[PDB]
C-alpha cells in the first residue's frame, strides 16, 4: 500500500505517533515519506545483509527478524515481514521501540537527511485529524 501523507498521518496518529517522545506526528510522516514514500512494500536490501522494510525502512539487523540479516537482534521482535503489511502497526510499534531503545529518530536517516530541521508538519499540513 502507498499511503497518501494525510492518511499516513492519520493512521500514524491513530497509533499514538504524534508527539511520541516528543516527535510530532509530521515527524513520523515525513520520516515515512523519505524513508519509503509512503510504500508500506518498500524493501531496500542492503549490501552489509540487512534490509530495510516498510513504510519506515526499519532494518533487520537490530529491530527485525528478516533471518538472513548477520547479528540480528530483532528488538522489535518482529519478523521483518510483519513491517510490510498495509497496516502500519507494526511499523509505528517497532519505531516506536526503535526510540524507546535510546535511539531518537536520527535512527532512521532519511529522517535525519530529509526531516530533521525541516517543517514536518508541512506533512501533516492539510490533513484531517
Known sequence: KVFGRCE???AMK???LDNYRGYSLGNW???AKFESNFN????????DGS????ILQINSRWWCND???????NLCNIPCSALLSSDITASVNC????????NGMNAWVAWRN??????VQAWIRGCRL
Request: charged fraction near 25%; charge should be positive; hydrophobic fraction near 20%.
Open 40 to 47: 508500506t512494500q518498500a524493501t531496500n536490501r542492503n549490501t
Open 67 to 73: 533471518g538472513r540479516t548477520p547479528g540480528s537482534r
Open 14 to 16: 491513530r497509533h499514538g
Open 8 to 10: 499516513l498521518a492519520a
Open 114 to 119: 530529509r526531516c530533521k530541521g525541516t517543517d
Open 95 to 102: 519505531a516506536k521501540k526503535i526510540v524507546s531503545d535510546g
Open 29 to 31: 510522516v515525513c520520516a
Open 51 to 54: 534490509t530495510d522494510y516498510g
